[PDB]
Amino acid sequence: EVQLLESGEGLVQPGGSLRLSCAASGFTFKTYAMSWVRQAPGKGLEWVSAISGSGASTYYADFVEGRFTISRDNSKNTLYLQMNSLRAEDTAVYYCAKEPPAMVWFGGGYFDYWGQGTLVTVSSA
Amino acid sequence: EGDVTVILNNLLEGYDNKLRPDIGVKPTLIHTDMYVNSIGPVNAINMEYTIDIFFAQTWYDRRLKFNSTIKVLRLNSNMVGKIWIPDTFFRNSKKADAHWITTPNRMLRIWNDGRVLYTLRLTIDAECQLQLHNFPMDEHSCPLEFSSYGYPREEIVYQWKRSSVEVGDTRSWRLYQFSFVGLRNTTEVVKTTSGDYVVMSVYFDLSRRMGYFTIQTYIPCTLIVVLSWVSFWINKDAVPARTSLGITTVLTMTTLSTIARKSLPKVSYVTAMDLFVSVCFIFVFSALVEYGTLHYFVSSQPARAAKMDSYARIFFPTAFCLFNLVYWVSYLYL
Amino acid sequence: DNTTVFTRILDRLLDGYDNRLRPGLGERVTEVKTDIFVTSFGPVSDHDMEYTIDVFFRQSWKDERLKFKGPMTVLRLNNLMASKIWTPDTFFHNGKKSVAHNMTMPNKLLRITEDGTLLYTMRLTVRAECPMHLEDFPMDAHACPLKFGSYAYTRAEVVYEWTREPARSVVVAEDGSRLNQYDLLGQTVDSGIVQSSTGEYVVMTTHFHLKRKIGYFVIQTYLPCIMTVILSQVSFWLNRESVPARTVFGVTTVLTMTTLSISARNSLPKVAYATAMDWFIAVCYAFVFSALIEFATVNYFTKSQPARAAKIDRLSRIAFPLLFGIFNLVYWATYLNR
Amino acid sequence: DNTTVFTRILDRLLDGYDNRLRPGLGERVTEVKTDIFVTSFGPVSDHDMEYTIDVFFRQSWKDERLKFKGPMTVLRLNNLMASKIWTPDTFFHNGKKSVAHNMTMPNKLLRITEDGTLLYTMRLTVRAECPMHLEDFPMDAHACPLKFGSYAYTRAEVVYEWTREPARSVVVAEDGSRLNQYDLLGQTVDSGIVQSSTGEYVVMTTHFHLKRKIGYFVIQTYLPCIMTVILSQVSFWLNRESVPARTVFGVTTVLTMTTLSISARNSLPKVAYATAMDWFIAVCYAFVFSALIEFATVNYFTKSQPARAAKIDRLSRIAFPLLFGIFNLVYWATYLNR
Amino acid sequence: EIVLTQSPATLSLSPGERATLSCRASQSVSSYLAWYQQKPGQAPRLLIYDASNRATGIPARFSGSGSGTDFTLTISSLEPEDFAVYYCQQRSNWPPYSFGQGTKLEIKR
Amino acid sequence: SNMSLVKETVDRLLKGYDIRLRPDFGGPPVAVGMNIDIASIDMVSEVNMDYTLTMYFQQAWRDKRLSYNVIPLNLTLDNRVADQLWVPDTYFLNDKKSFVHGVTVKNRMIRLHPDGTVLYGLRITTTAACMMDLRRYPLDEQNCTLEIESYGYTTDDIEFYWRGDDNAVTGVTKIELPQFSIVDYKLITKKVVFSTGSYPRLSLSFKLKRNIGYFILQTYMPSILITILSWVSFWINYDASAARVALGITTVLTMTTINTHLRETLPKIPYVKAIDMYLMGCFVFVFMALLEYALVNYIFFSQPARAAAIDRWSRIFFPVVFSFFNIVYWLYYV
Amino acid sequence: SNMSLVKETVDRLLKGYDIRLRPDFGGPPVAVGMNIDIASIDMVSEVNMDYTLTMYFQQAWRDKRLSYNVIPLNLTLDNRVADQLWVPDTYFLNDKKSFVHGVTVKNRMIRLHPDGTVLYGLRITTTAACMMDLRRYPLDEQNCTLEIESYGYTTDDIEFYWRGDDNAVTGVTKIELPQFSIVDYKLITKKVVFSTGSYPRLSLSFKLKRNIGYFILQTYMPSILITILSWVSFWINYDASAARVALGITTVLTMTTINTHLRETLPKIPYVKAIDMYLMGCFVFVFMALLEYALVNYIFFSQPARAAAIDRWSRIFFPVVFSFFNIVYWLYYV
Ligand SMILES: *[C@@H]1O[C@H](CO)[C@@H](O)[C@H](O)[C@H]1NC(C)=O
């Protein structure tokens, strides 16, 4: 029943921008913390950013020096990630993953479910 | 409003904390743990020893199970008075206290299936009667007993967890004269005017260290008794010299004899230290009385006194050496 | 009608407030900034291996649930209010028996800023454990700590940090020292983690470094013992025919030595092992004993081997002071280099 | 149905009743009738200048707001209502730390008669301060007071008075005496006024008269001192030739007297001036020192004026004993007649 | 910071055998370690969370254990489809989340 | 379910329960029956004239307001429900300071029975005043008591008795005091009178005979042996002035040292006692030995024969008179 | 009636009273006037570095909210109303252990006045820390203070002043300490700043002068007289070697006894003091006298002519040098 559907796929020139959106359905959206995990071609999984289940608090990985920004809308049941000042090193499949609710951290430490992911290629070609 | 707030408000609705879980179905089974922070001073005078522990208890309360997505509620000491809590008490404690600074030092954690974990920090002045024979060569192993105060075996049963009682460093503990050797835990049923109660015990093996006592008592006393022996080797006409030497050794021995028992309760039996000190005092007494007798007999039987001087020279050291040998082998054997 | 505004603000503040839940339950790891002002470093009891300390414990954190807008920027609260909001449940790991002062009223303060930041100050006396290694007594230096942290909240829920640079977050008043047998050299602060069966917890530690004063023990134990040994040796310059004098002298010197040893050990706490003071006592007592037995040998060999008696008297006269001087040099050097 | 009427009386007894106002607040002065039953006169601590006393404290006053007309004549309230009505704020002026016993339940009782008269009995232990003037120790006698009264209500609002003829309002039980040092001779109740910085108050006083037992001090310090003086005398009663004997005799007598005095003082409280026993021990120690100096003079003058040596020996042998005897005669005569 | 290291970098085994994957952390991550399986061409799947608990619907052959800095995932009776890349993920303070480099579990012929 | 049945039963019983009325308010007096389990007896203080004891204090009355028959089980309720029931206002008339232990919870019990019986338990530590007469100390027997009484209710309302008659008090036989031994105890149920009216009363009493071995070894042997030392002087030739004087006066100094250290080590009873009398006797004996030597020394310079005669008769008599004094003292004080 | 009038008045006052708002919450600072009636100063302990005092503590302020005009008389309300009014947060910065007396009821006073003035009295016992400098003990004067500050407010809110100027403290001329004498007391008022903000402070300080007669007759005279006895050995003849050695070393032993017994007679101050200086001076004098005799004994046989002159020179030298030592000591320490 749970369904995370990433979108926003498209080419981007270096230094450009892109807005990924992950539509969620099948569960209460406002109780789960959602995160963005990216996998570069032929590499391992890497965590990008996370947002609280109410949208109040946002956390980003080190490699994203204030370039990305994560957001959500509990009315639309959608998770966003506006990316800016991109680079060729940012190419990867980006997954939205949901984290169970808990009284520790801002949710259990793991991702209970994952999306299928969308390829985001950055190249001027 | 919040999810956890609604869970808590629903849990506490229609809850009677006067009634134990399963008040009329089956006995409440409580698993117990201890983390011994330290074992404080053992004062044999009052027959008690201090111990600081983190005490944990776990049980199942079917009225505290919820059906949220959250798996565990992590709580302060705020709910402890709101839910039912076992009335565990320490049967052999002269006085115990919980800690309240800065905030009550309890912890509560309720699981999805109604399992409850409750932990609190305690300091206990447990009582144990020390059999002070062989002191200072005495070993002790005295307990910490706890049980429910009001629930007999048919309501509450205690059970030790796999690794329940654990000790910390043991290096910083305040055991002055003793040395923690090990611990054991036990279960029993004790009959009382109220009923049969499951009593849980933990034993702590404490071995005294001679140290203080050996130095202060044993060495000075031995050398004081040797002073009379050296007195024997002076002269027969040195009457003031021998008399003064004997009397001052008696005075020194009397001074020593008092502080041996200042570390002991007013027990009315004889300990190893008391036997040693009394034997030394008798040795000094006998040396001086021997000289007195010899000086008296110098006018009666000089031929006999000439033998007696060397006979005492021989006997006194030998008797004291045999006394040391038998004393030390027997007591160290025990 | 200018007080109704504040009373309504305070009344609304707690509206729908659950103090069983930490601030930032679903957003953050609650982060408490701590500071300690030691108003007086109380006495140290080596008998109990503990020390007392009186502090103004200041803990700050953020509570978005208590944001407010009004004429005032900082809002004063009373104990009846502070007992209704969530506060960190800090405890002292090695604490023995702490008292929170409440005369004439509870010595606590709670301030809230418009943005939800709280400052909770508390005046409280702490009796903490001071595990002491008294091997080098009375020349022993101790560094015993004050460790605090949260009960019931693991590092995944509440973490403590020093409000300023750690070294400047623990401040001792200039006239704070209430020590009469020690001297407070300074302190070191640190952070850490303690693993338990219930999880990992943050620990905030502070070590106060102490150095025992020696003058008292010198002037009331060491000098009397040294001078008793000197007397015992003074015995050697008398004449052998003064047998009663030499015997009474030696025996009364031994009696005085036992008196001194009893007094010294009765001063020290009852630790079952040897301290520098015990070593000095035993060696000096041995010197007195050996002088007495040497006199006994001299008296024996008089009337039968007068030449050897005089020879050994001269030899003891020459040797015993040299042995004692060498022992003093070695002992004082080895225990003062440390 | 009797239970119904009793419960209704209890419930209606507190209608419109405010416990913040003393009865007759605007019309009369509240009369409280006090009565003490001393259950045991606890120990008297000389060091702390205090004594302990267990009492059954009874107070009776009239409150019109508690009048009831029911089948019974008097009803015994519970402590919950005892805390709901007004009661006098009696306190002990010289108290140090007292306790209101509450094992197993608060040892209190409140009884209301139809007239509205209340009888409020408490059981409590008072540790009161008793100033000591130990000039005549151990021949001293003291009058330990026990003053009490209202803490807040001045002479114009609350007045205390004994329920019977004052002399027979403070009663001590036949076996209510826990005194080792002292003997309780009798009490002296009184009533007075005290002017504080807040007004004029009624103070109810009671002095317990005490006399210290002397036999222990006699047998423990006076006899040893006198006997040691007699030894200093038999020093003179001895041959002039035996120089080492007389020397050791005198010096060991001095050491014995030092031991006796040091032991004697330990028992005494830490007073600042000289007690009778301090006078006695000082004069005895003086006699011993004087005897040793006399022997020193005799030894100095022997072998050069042996006639003079013998003359002064006989003079001392006659002078010292009678001198000490007359000292004792005057000392005891003056100190055992106060 | 916390750095998860997975050894071996690869693990060649045949069906029906028993596998053991190790994730070792530089500092202690308490019990917060999870294991993920990513079959090539798909999205990851949660296997073990809190270092010991099996996720919902996971066959019982997946077992995990450990705590602190040393963790292990054991597969008993490798089925043919249990050949994929396995990741360990940690939740901590300094890096909020972090993944291991991954261990590729291939068929032995 | 059965849990709900018990809950409704307890809510009904507590509903409209007037805590201000005793069971059988207007009617026959409610009978309260007492059990005491002496957990321990602690320091018996001669100086303060009191002893401390820990006990499980139980009371059992019968309340019909609390009668239930819907279930056969005995309802042990959380101890905090005791604040909603009526319990008797029992109080110990001679306690100095007492408390209920409160770790991990207030150590009290409350149990209901279908026929209305209430079983009310407490764990109490009390310090009770003991009128102690230490004139014969240490050869003394003390009688320490504990009076139990009702503060407000009179004998027409509440009636006290012991449950099990003589088996009401238990655990007395297994107390182990380092300084005493309990030889007997009695249970007394009487009635008394105060300025308010008659009152029920119970009384538990103990008889403590002080152990004498410690006092013998620690006090009597030193004095006797130093007296013997003092005697040894008689067998030294009356020309040994220095020796005899040193021996005698150093025995005097030793006796003073013993007495002083005994003062410091023993309890501070500031009136005269048997131990004080014995020490004074021995001190006076040593003083007599010194005086008789002084007399002999003043004599032999005139009548050496008379000096020898005095020495011989002193040799004979001093031991005999000392032993006779001992026989008289030991017979009188035993 | 009058009682109804007062009751309605008090209800009106206490209805609408926010206990969290100070008088003139936004206005100028509330001025609090403080008296103190010193009742006693119990135990000035030098080992604990503290003193205890009981006092009646009063605070007066004007609260406009509590203003009434329907009646002329002052309202002395039951003390429990003080839990319903705003009272200042006054604390003693240097106290250790303190309490408000609570028998028969909490000893506190709350008196109102028509204009809105409030008088708030408390009876307190405070153990306050007083750092003592004992380098000159027992010839020293201590300076013990009581710092009264506000815990939360600053001078904008609260200002403290002694109500009555220099008569705000009374009863200080009746205190009779067992060992001291209050020579002077003083009142101060100032302001203190912490990391938390400025604060208003008040200070009451005393000056204590220790009493000397006890110390003289206890510790000083015996040491001087033992020194005199040590000198006496100069008078004795050269030949009396046993006499002189016995005298000298007995003086050494008795000086040691005095030192080691004053050890535990005096408070445990583990640093050095003037009494220590004096007793060490006497000890070294006695030691030097015994050394002098030893030198004379050695150097006699070889040259009595010089030995006799040395003995006479010692006879002259020791008294004058000891007098010089006494003079320098007494002037330097007075
Ligand atoms: C501490 O003092 C305050 C102020 O009166 C009081 O409310 C509180 O109950 C006191 N606490 C204790 C434990 O006495």
Q: 3-state SS string over F257-291?
A: HHHHHHHHHCCCCCCCCHHHHHHHHHHHHHHHHHH
Single-letter amino acid, residue C46? D
In whole angstroms, what is the distance from residue B288 CA to residue B296 CA? 12
Contacts of B163 (CB under 8 A, 6+ apart): none
- For C:64-103, CB contacts with A below 8 A are 64
Report helix, strand and coil shares of chain C as percent, to nearest 5.
Answer: 35, 30, 35
Who contacts G55 (Cβ-Cβ below 8 Å, separation ≥6)? Answer: G36, G37, G38, G39, G123, G124, G126
Residues of C in contact with A106 (CB under 8 A): 24, 26-29
Under DSSP, is residue C227 helix (H, G, I), strand (E, B) or coil?
helix
Which residues of chain E make contact with A62, given a CB cutoff of 8 A?
95
Look at the alpha carbons of G269, G256, G276, G214 in this order and tell me if their dihedral is positive or negative. Answer: positive
List b or e across B63-100, with b for residues whose CB sees 16 or more CB atoms inside 10 angstroms. Answer: bbebeeebbebbbbbbbbeebbbbbbbbbbbbbbebbb
For residues D211, D216, D217, D218, the Cα torsion angle rounded to the nearest 10 degrees is: 110
DSSP string of G258-316? HHHHHHHHS----S--HHHHHHHHHHHHHHHHHHHHHHHHHHHTT-HHHHHHHHHHHHH
Residue indicated by tokens 């107390």? F175
Beta bridge partners of A59: A50
**C-alpha dist (Å) from residue C194 to C59, C147, E68:** 20, 11, 12
Which parts of F are annotated binding residues? 91, 150-151, 196
For residues C69 and C8, is the Cβ–Cβ distance under 8 A? no
- Closest chain C residue by Cα to residue B239: C244
Count of residues making up chain G: 334
Nearest CA to ligand 1 atom 13: C102
| Residue F156: CB atoms within 10 Å | 10
**What are the residues facing C270 on neighbouring strands?**
none
Q: Please state, in angstroms and rounded to a whole number, the distance separating the CA atoms of residues B287 and B292.
A: 9
Beta strands in A32-116 (DSSP E): 33-39, 45-51, 58-60, 69-73, 78-83, 92-99, 113-114
Q: How far apart are CA E95 and CA E89, in angstroms?
A: 11
- d(CA C307, ligand 1 centre) in Å: 87
Architecture of domain G2-209: Distorted Sandwich (2.70)
Residue given tokens 């005294």 in the structure block? B208
- Interchain contact, B254 vs F101, CB within 8 Å: no
Phi then psi for residue F287, to 5 deg, are -60, -40
Q: Locate B172 and state its tokens.
A: 């910083």
> CATH assignment of C4-212, given 2.70.170.10, 3.40.50.300, 3.30.565.10, 1.20.120.1200?
2.70.170.10
- Tokens matching residue D185: 């001779």
Q: Which residues does F253 contact at the CB level (< 8 Å), separation at least 6?
A: B251, D252, D255, D256, D259
**Interrupted after residues, chain G (C–N over 2.5 Å):** none
| Gap between the Cα atoms of G288 and G285, Å rounded | 5
**What are the residue boundaries of the structural domains of chain F, listed by start?**
2-210, 213-332
According to DSSP, residue E4 is labeled: E
Encoded tokens for D308: 């003079």
Rounded to whole angstroms, the Cα distance separating B153 from B190 reads: 9
Q: Which 3-state string (H, E, C) describes chain D?
A: CHHHHHHHHHHHCCCCCCCCCCCCCCCCCEEEEEEEEEEEEEEEECCCCEEEEEEEEEEEEECHHHCCCCCCCEEEECHHHHCCCCCCCEEECCECCCEECCCECCCEEEEEECCCEEEEEEEEEEEEECCCCCCCCCCCEEEEECCEEECCCCCCCEEEEECCCHHHCEEECCCCECCCCEEEEEEEEEEEEEECCCCEEEEEEEEEEEEECCHHHHHHHHHHHHHHHHHHHHHHCCCCCCHHHHHHHHHHHHHHHHHHHHHHHHHCCCCCCCCHHHHHHHHHHHHHHHHHHHHHHHHHHCCCCHHHHHHHHHHHHHHHHHHHHHHHHHHHHHHCCC
Partner residue facing F242 (CB), from D107, D244, D252: D244
Strands G108-112 and G75-77: antiparallel
Was G329 annotated as part of a binding site? no
Contact status, residue A45 vs residue E38, Cβ threshold 8 Å: yes
Within 8 A by CB and 6+ apart from A12, the residues are A18, A86, A120, A121, A122
Q: Please state, as a whole number, how many other Cβ atoms lie within 10 Å of the Cβ of residue G83.
A: 10
Mutate to test the pocket of ligand 1, among C102, C105, C107, C124 (most ligand atoms within 8 A of CB): C102
Q: By CA distance, what is A31's nearest residue in C?
A: C26
Q: Is the preceding peptide bond at F104 cis, omega within 30 degrees of 0?
A: yes
Chains E and C contact (Cβ–Cβ under 8 Å for 3 or more pairs): yes
CATH fit for domain E4-107, picks 3.40.50.300, 1.20.1250.20, 1.20.1050.10, 2.60.40.10: 2.60.40.10
Cβ–Cβ below 8 Å for D299 and G254? no
Q: Does domain F2-210 have CATH number 3.40.109.10?
A: no
- DSSP one-letter code for C163: S
Contacts with B, A 28-87, CB within 8 Å: 31
- Closest alpha carbon to F106 in F122, F88, F130, F87: F122
Residue D291: both structure tokens together: 């005897």
Query: Rg (Cα) of chain B, in Å, rounded?
Result: 32
Cα C81 to ligand 1 centre (Å): 14
Residues of B in contact with C278 (CB under 8 A): 215
Q: Tell me if A53 and C156 make a contact (CB, 8 A cut-off).
A: no
Report yes or no: F123 and F100 within 8 Å, Cβ to Cβ: yes
- State how far the Cα of B208 lies from the Cα of F57, in Å rounded to an integer: 37
Residue E39: how many other CB atoms lie within 10 Å: 13
User: Would you say D230 and G229 are in contact if contact means Cβ atoms under 8 Å apart?
Assistant: no
Query: A100: distance to nearest CA of chain B, Å?
Result: 8
Partners of residue F125 on adjacent β-strands = F54, F99
Whose structure tokens read 């993944």?
E99
Which of F222, F48, F225, F44 is closest to F140 using CA atoms? F44
Helices (H), chain G: 2-14, 213-215, 221-232, 241-265, 274-300, 304-332
Nearest to D287 by CA among D324, D243, D316, D240: D324
- Going by the DSSP 8-state scheme, the letter that residue F211 receives in this structure is P
Phi, psi for residue C181 in degrees, rounded to 5: -115, 0
DSSP 8-state assignment for residue A47 = E
How far is the centre of ligand 1, averaged over its atoms, from the C-alpha of C105 (Å)?
7
On the CB side of G278, CA atoms within 13 Å amount to: 27
Instruction: Answer yes or no: do E30 and C199 touch at CB < 8 A.
Output: yes
- Amino acid identity of residue B7, one-letter, is I
CB F59 within 8 A of CB F120: yes
Give residue limits of the domains in chain C.
4-212, 215-337
From the number of C-beta atoms within 10 Å of its C-beta (0-12, 13-18, 19+), residue G329 rates as: middle
- Inspect the structure and tell me whether chains G and A have 3 or more CB pairs less than 8 Å apart: no
* Position in ligand 1 atom list of the atom nearest CA C103: 2
C178 is in an annotated binding site: no
- Chain D CB contacts of G123 below 8 Å: 91, 151
Give Cα separations from G297 to C318, G234, G237, G285 (angstroms).
19, 12, 11, 19
Domains of chain A listed by start with CATH number? 3-120 (2.60.40.10)
Determine which residue's CA is closest to atom 2 belonging to ligand 1.
C102
B126: buried, middle or exposed (CB in 10 Å: 19+, 13-18, 0-12)? buried
Peptide bond into B136 cis (omega under 30): yes
Coil, helix or strand for C150?
strand
Cβ of C304: how many Cβ atoms within 10 Å? 8
**Angle made by CA atoms C206, C107, C86, in degrees to the nearest 5:** 75
Do D158 and D202 contact (CB within 8 A), yes or no? yes
**HSE-CB of D75 using CA atoms within 13 angstroms:** 29
Measured distance between the N- and C-terminal CA atoms of chain C, rounded to whole angstroms? 71
Structurally, at CATH architecture level, domain D216-335 sits in Up-down Bundle (1.20)
> Are D191 and D166 spatial neighbours (Cβ–Cβ below 8 Å)?
yes
Beta bridge partners of F292: none
Atom 14 (ligand 1): residue with closest C-alpha? Answer: C102
What are the backbone dihedrals phi and psi of residue B75, each rounded to the nearest 5 degrees, phi first?
Answer: -130, 165
* Residue of chain E nearest C201, judged by CA positions: E30
Pairing of the two strands D158-162 and D30-45? parallel
Closest chain F CA to residue D242: F241
D121 is in an annotated binding site: yes
Whether B195 has its CB under 8 Å from any CB of chain F: the answer is no
- In the reported structure, the alpha carbon of residue G153 is separated from the centroid of ligand 1 by a whole-number distance in angstroms of 19
**8 A C-beta contact, residue G229 and residue G251:** yes
Report how far apart, in Å, the C-alpha atoms of B56 and of each of B35, B65, B160, D266 are.
9, 20, 11, 50
Say which DSSP state G157 is in. T
Which chains form contacts with chain B, at 3 or more CB pairs under 8 Å? Answer: A, C, F
Measure CA of the first residue to CA of the last residue in chain G; give whole Å: 71
Report the topology of domain D2-213: Acetylcholine Binding Protein; Chain: A, (2.70.170)
CA pseudo-torsion sign B289, B291, B295, B298: positive
Give residue for tokens 């409590």: D124
**Measured distance CA(B157)–CA(B86) in Å, rounded:** 11
Pairing of strands G30-41, G169-170: parallel
Residues 6+ away with beta carbon under 8 Å from G70: G5, G9
User: What kind of architecture, by CATH, is found in domain C215-337?
Assistant: Up-down Bundle (1.20)
Method of elucidation: cryo-EM
Structure resolution, Å: 3.0
Instruction: List residues near ligand 1 (CB under 6 A).
Output: C 102, 105-106
Whole-Å CA distances, D243 to C235, D295, G145: 21, 9, 60
In total, chain C counts a number of residues equal to 338
Q: Which residues of G touch C77 (CB under 8 A)?
A: 20
Cβ burial of F334 (10 Å; 0-12, 13-18, 19+) is exposed
Q: Name the phi and psi angles at G41, rounded to 5.
A: -130, 105
Cα–Cα distance, C129 to G54 (Å, whole number): 32
Neighbours of G25 (CB within 10 A): 17
- Contact criterion met (CB < 8 Å) for A101 and B70: yes
Does D104 sit behind a cis peptide bond, omega within 30 degrees of 0 on the bond before it? yes
**Distances in whole angstroms, Cα of residue A46 to Cα of each of A83, C156, E88:** 16, 22, 11
> How far apart, in Å, do the first and last CA atoms of chain A sit?
40
* CA–CA separation, G29 and D300 (whole Å): 85
- For residue F276, the chain D residues in CB contact (below 8 A) are 216, 219-220
Q: Does E54 touch chain A (CB under 8 A)?
A: no
Q: Mind spelling out the 3-state secondary structure of B198-246? A: EEEEEEEEEEECCHHHHHHHHHHHHHHHHHHHHHHCCCCCCHHHHHHHH
Q: Which of residues 271-290 of G touch D (CB under 8 A)?
A: none
Pairing of strands E10-13, E103-107: parallel
CB F75 within 8 A of CB B57: no
Reported CATH class of domain G213-332: mainly alpha
CB B63 within 8 A of CB B21: yes
